[PDB]
Write a protein that binds this ligand. Structure first.
Ligand SMILES: *[C@@H]1O[C@H](CO)[C@@H](O[C@@H]2O[C@H](CO)[C@@H](O)[C@H](O)[C@H]2NC(C)=O)[C@H](O)[C@H]1NC(C)=O
Ligand SMILES: *[C@@H]1O[C@H](CO)[C@@H](O[C@@H]2O[C@H](CO)[C@@H](O)[C@H](O)[C@H]2NC(C)=O)[C@H](O)[C@H]1NC(C)=O
Ligand code: NAG
Lengths: 49, 109
C-alpha cells in the first residue's frame, strides 16, 4: 500500500489469526507446535514435489 | 476490501465518468506517511497475570508504555478496559514487566 514498515513475525502471525476469528492468545500459547507443524509440512511438500 | 482491485492503497470511494466509447473511474485512496520507530512487546503481565490488547498494539518511547492502533499513532494509557487477561506469564515469549492502571480504586477513594 505505502512504504515498508518492519514488524516481528510472531505479531504478524497474531494479526493473521485475529483476522480469521481465532483470538491472538492461541498463537502465543501454541507457538512451538505451530512452528513444528509448519516445518513438517514444508518438508513433506518437498518429497511430494 | 480486496487489495489493489480499484486504487493503490486503502480504498475510500470512486466517481464514474463517461467517455467516447468507455468509462473512466476516479478512485480516492488513503496512504500513510511520516512514520516513526518504536519498541514493542507481545503481552504485559502484572501481579502474575498476562494481559493482551483488544484492538491495538503495545508501544514504548523508551521509558513508558502505551496502547496504540495499528494504522495511526495516538497513544493511550494502559488500563483494564482495553486489555484482557488469559493465563500467567510463564510460557509466552517476549514478556515485559510493567504496571496496569485501574479506575475503580482511584474512583472509590
Ligand atoms: C515518553 O513519553 C512519556 C509520556 O508522554 C514522557 O513522560 C512525560 O515527559 C514530560 C517531559 O517533561 C513530562 O512533562 C510528563 O509529566 C511526563 N509524563 C509521564 C506520564 O511520565 C517521557 O518523557 C517520554 N520519554 C522520552 C525519552 O521522551
Ligand atoms: C519480572 O518480575 C519477576 C518477579 O519479580 C522476575 O522474576 C524473577 O527474576 C529474577 C531475576 O533473574 C530471578 O532471580 C527470580 O528467581 C525470578 N522470580 C522471582 C519469583 O523472583 C522477572 O525476572 C521480571 N522480568 C523482567 C523482564 O524484569
Ligand atoms: C528506527 O530505528 C532503526 C534502528 O536503527 C532504524 O533502522 C529505522 O530506520 C528507524 N526508523 C526510521 C523511520 O528511520
Amino acid at each position: 500500500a505505502g512504504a515498508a514498515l518492519q514488524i516481528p513475525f510472531a505479531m504478524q502471525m497474531a494479526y493473521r489469526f485475529n483476522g480469521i476469528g481465532v483470538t491472538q492468545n492461541v498463537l502465543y500459547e501454541n507457538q512451538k507446535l505451530i512452528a513444528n507443524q509448519f516445518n513438517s509440512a514444508i518438508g513433506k511438500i518437498q518429497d511430494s514435489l | 476490501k480486496r487489495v489493489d482491485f480499484c486504487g493503490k492503497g486503502y480504498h475510500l470511494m470512486s466517481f464514474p465518468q463517461s467517455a467516447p466509447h468507455g468509462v473512466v473511474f476516479l478512485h480516492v485512496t488513503y496512504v500513510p506517511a511520516q512514520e516513526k520507530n518504536f519498541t514493542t512487546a507481545p503481552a504485559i503481565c502484572h501481579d502474575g497475570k498476562a494481559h493482551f490488547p483488544r484492538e491495538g498494539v503495545f508501544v514504548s518511547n523508551g521509558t513508558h508504555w502505551f496502547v496504540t492502533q495499528r494504522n495511526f499513532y495516538e497513544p493511550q494509557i494502559i488500563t483494564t478496559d482495553n486489555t484482557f487477561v488469559s493465563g500467567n506469564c510463564d510460557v509466552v515469549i517476549g514478556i515485559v514487566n510493567n504496571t496496569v492502571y485501574d479506575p475503580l480504586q482511584p474512583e472509590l477513594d
